[PDB]
Paper text:
Ferritin from the marine pennate diatom Pseudo-nitzschia multiseries (PmFTN) plays a key role in sustaining growth in iron-limited ocean environments. Typically formed from 24 subunits arranged as a symmetric, hollow sphere, ferritins take up soluble Fe2+ and catalyze its oxidation, with the resulting Fe3+ being stored as an oxy-hydroxide mineral in its central cavity. The di-iron catalytic ferroxidase center of PmFTN (sites A and B) has a nearby third iron site (site C) in an arrangement typically observed in prokaryotic ferritins. Here we demonstrate that Glu-44, a site C ligand, and Glu-130, a residue that bridges iron bound at sites B and C, limit the rate of post-oxidation reorganization of iron coordination and the rate at which Fe3+ exits the ferroxidase center for storage within the mineral core.
Two structures were obtained from E44H PmFTN crystals soaked for 45 min (E44H Fe (45 min)) and 3 h (E44H Fe (3 h)) in aerobic Fe2+ solution. All three sites are occupied by iron ions with modest differences in metal occupancy regardless of the crystal soaking time. These structures revealed that the coordination spheres of the iron ions in sites A, B, and C are markedly altered in the E44H variant relative to the wild type PmFTN structure, exhibiting what might be described as ligand scrambling. The side chain conformation of His-51 is altered such that this residue now coordinates to the iron at site C (Fe-C) rather than Fe-A, which is thus coordinated only by Glu-15, Glu-48, a water molecule, and the bridging water or oxo/hydroxo group. His-44 and Glu-130 are ligands of Fe-B. Fe-C is coordinated by His-51 and Glu-130 and forms weaker interactions with Gln-126 and Glu-47. A water molecule is observed bridging Fe-C and Fe-B. As a result of these differences, Fe-C is displaced toward site A by ∼3.5 Å as compared with wild type PmFTN and the E44Q variant. Structural data showed that, in both cases, iron at one of the sites (Fe-B in E130A PmFTN and Fe-A in E44H PmFTN) has fewer ligands than in the wild type structure, suggesting that inequivalent Fe2+ affinity at Fe-A and Fe-B accounts for the loss of positive cooperativity. E44Q PmFTN has a rate constant ∼6-fold higher than that of wild type, whereas the rate constant for E44H PmFTN is about 3-fold lower than that of wild type PmFTN. Mineralization in E44Q PmFTN was similar to wild type protein (initial rates of 7.0 ± 0.9 and 4.1 ± 0.8 μm Fe2+ min−1, respectively), whereas mineralization in E44H PmFTN was significantly slower (1.7 ± 0.5 μm Fe2+ min−1).
Residue numbers in the entry:
A (entry chain E), C (entry chain A): 1 to 158
B (entry chain F), D (entry chain F), E (entry chain F): 1 to 159
Write the structure that this text describes.
Amino acid sequence: SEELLDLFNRQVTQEFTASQVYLSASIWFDQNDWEGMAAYMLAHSAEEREHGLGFVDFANKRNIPIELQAVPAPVSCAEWSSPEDVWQSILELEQANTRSLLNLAEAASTCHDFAVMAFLNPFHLQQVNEEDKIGSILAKVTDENRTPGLLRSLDVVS
Amino acid sequence: SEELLDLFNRQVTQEFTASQVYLSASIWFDQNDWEGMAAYMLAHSAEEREHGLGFVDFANKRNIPIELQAVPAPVSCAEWSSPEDVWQSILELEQANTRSLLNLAEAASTCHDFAVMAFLNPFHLQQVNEEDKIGSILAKVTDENRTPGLLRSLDVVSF
Amino acid sequence: SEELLDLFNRQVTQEFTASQVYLSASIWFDQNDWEGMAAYMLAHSAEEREHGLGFVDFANKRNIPIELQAVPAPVSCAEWSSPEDVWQSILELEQANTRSLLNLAEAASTCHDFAVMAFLNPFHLQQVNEEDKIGSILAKVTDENRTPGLLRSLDVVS
Amino acid sequence: SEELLDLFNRQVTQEFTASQVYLSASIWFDQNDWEGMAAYMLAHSAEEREHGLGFVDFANKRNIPIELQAVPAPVSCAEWSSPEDVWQSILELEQANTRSLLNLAEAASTCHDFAVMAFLNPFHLQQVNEEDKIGSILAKVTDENRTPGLLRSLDVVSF
Amino acid sequence: SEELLDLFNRQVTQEFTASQVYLSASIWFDQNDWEGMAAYMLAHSAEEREHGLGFVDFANKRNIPIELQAVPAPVSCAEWSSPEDVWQSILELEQANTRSLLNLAEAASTCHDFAVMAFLNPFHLQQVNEEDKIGSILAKVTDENRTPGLLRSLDVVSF
Ligand SMILES: [Fe+3]
Ligand SMILES: [Fe+3]
Ligand SMILES: [Fe+3]
Ligand SMILES: [Fe+3]
Ligand SMILES: [Fe+3]
Ligand SMILES: [Fe+3]
Ligand SMILES: [Fe+3]
Ligand SMILES: [Fe+3]
Ligand SMILES: [Fe+3]
Ligand SMILES: [Fe+3]
Ligand SMILES: [Fe+3]
Ligand SMILES: [Fe+3]
Ligand SMILES: [Fe+3]
Ligand SMILES: [Fe+3]
Ligand SMILES: [Fe+3]
Ligand SMILES: [Fe+3]
Ligand SMILES: [Fe+3]
Ligand SMILES: [Fe+3]
């Protein structure tokens, strides 16, 4: 299906869009002196770009033509006013990256595209790990931010 | 699907049930002075526990509520009176572990739960290997036990 | 001596019962993003199972017939709503593990079973250490949790 | 001599035929839980393939056209019902590999093809060693199988 | 308690008696070409001597007078005519070593001799292990000896 091919392309776009969103979070954090959260965001910005590159390389091998799309300007930073806002946006982004992976897998399953399904398996599993991790950070952030200054004291951790 | 959550929970209970059945087998072997077969069973009891803990960890990560169930008393050690009986029970146990993983996978499949299916793949292949290994032990035991004392003579050598 | 045998059997069951309660605690902690406390509980679950295995091994050597019982489902996790609740249950578990060791010892002492008494000596000493360690963590948990978020900030540490 | 070219080509087919017969034997052994004898056969299947590839390489170098023939289905695994049957077939197989090398050498000899004869010398001596080894295995199997379970007891120890 | 001193002295004699019984067993095994079982017995003869020397040393330290008694001739080697007979005697010997340690401990206990009881604890646990090991050997011997030559075949492999 040209549609399975669309969805695979769209996954590339989604990983690069996520890369930029993470970068935007790193900027917000740095500008507000949360250098720890900033470094985490930057490293994860690079990792999303790596995912997208992984998809590109597979596509090239499997003759799925890739048409690189615009990477949209991230928009959530206009509204962010605390670390909790940023982490909630990042969770939402990953929950989205996951849904788009599952849509892609459904299409591949419908088309009997065994190679594409196999390729995706480690990404399905990585997404479970990432959502769990982000969810856990967000819950720590939310809880520590109930006492003034205390969240800051644990950016100084990680 | 509540059914999927359910089957996932039950797989934990299955792995822990298996862990206890292996422990039971180790005891029987030790009590009847088959230390080599007893060691094998004990190690495999640990491994089944690790499997169950694997499932627990993934569940936690994927927000599948785990409720720990009673781990039944192993009762196959009532009817055991030779090593063949024990290995036969262990074979049936793994055959059941396999079937329950396949049922789990089919529920995942119906639900399009690609992450659960991916998680299960190495277990599917492990079970193939375990059933084969167990099968092959049981064959060997059954053949060797046709001569008095000969099986004993290879608890020593192997294991 | 049937009483000593029975108590020896129940001790195995008590260890495995405890293992499951520790597993249940690690689950509650993980679900609630206390990964540190979760890890402590998981390690201790393994340890409890090791203690049970220890009793099994001695029993086999000493011809104490072991019949493996059911390991009852843990039921405290339904009532836990904070780390404090979890640690308080685990303390109570260890106090019970201790009482049942002392009963088993007393039975052995009545029977003049010097080998069983000697076998049990390191376990008595280990219970003292565990009760102390758990009581101490509970104290620290109870104190830290008087300030919102502060406990979180110290799961992340130790 | 077209006859020499021919016999040279056929030796490749012989080595590959042997490779498959060994593979067949491994399968039979594995299926009947003789993992040690199955490993031996598998390794020897690889080795026969290497022999055939040796012949191919020399042919290429010496401008003897190689045309690859069908590699027949191994069918001796129809009649196998004990390890003795399998080892007996393998012995006959090597006896045939030997005879075919000797026929090859005799054709070379008639043609004064000193390079082919030199090439063959290590294979002649290898076959002597293989027939002896196989022979000795088969004797051992046949003796051990006179007591129930005893052969099994030495798939474990040896191999 | 003179009774405690006494029982302590007798335990030395017991350990040395055991040492000689093991030596006797080694001789029987060697004479009948069971070199592996003979080695095991010889090593265990040394170990019993070490036990007796342990008791002597503690006694000296705790001012319990030691008077060395005659070490009886081992006479169980009159009735031995198979390895089973020998291992059976060794099992009974350890059962007696255990009982005598327990009697010693009970005397200590009555006398509130906490240092003697503490000294004995590792021996109590060692005896548990030795009786289990011996028991398990004897089972294996008895099973293997049901087929002619088979026991011999595992003096070689084990030990
Ligand atoms: Fe399209
Ligand atoms: Fe398109
Ligand atoms: Fe397009
Ligand atoms: Fe991604
Ligand atoms: Fe990501
Ligand atoms: Fe990632
Ligand atoms: Fe399992
Ligand atoms: Fe298993
Ligand atoms: Fe497994
Ligand atoms: Fe415990
Ligand atoms: Fe504990
Ligand atoms: Fe402990
Ligand atoms: Fe060949
Ligand atoms: Fe060959
Ligand atoms: Fe060869
Ligand atoms: Fe001794
Ligand atoms: Fe001893
Ligand atoms: Fe000793």
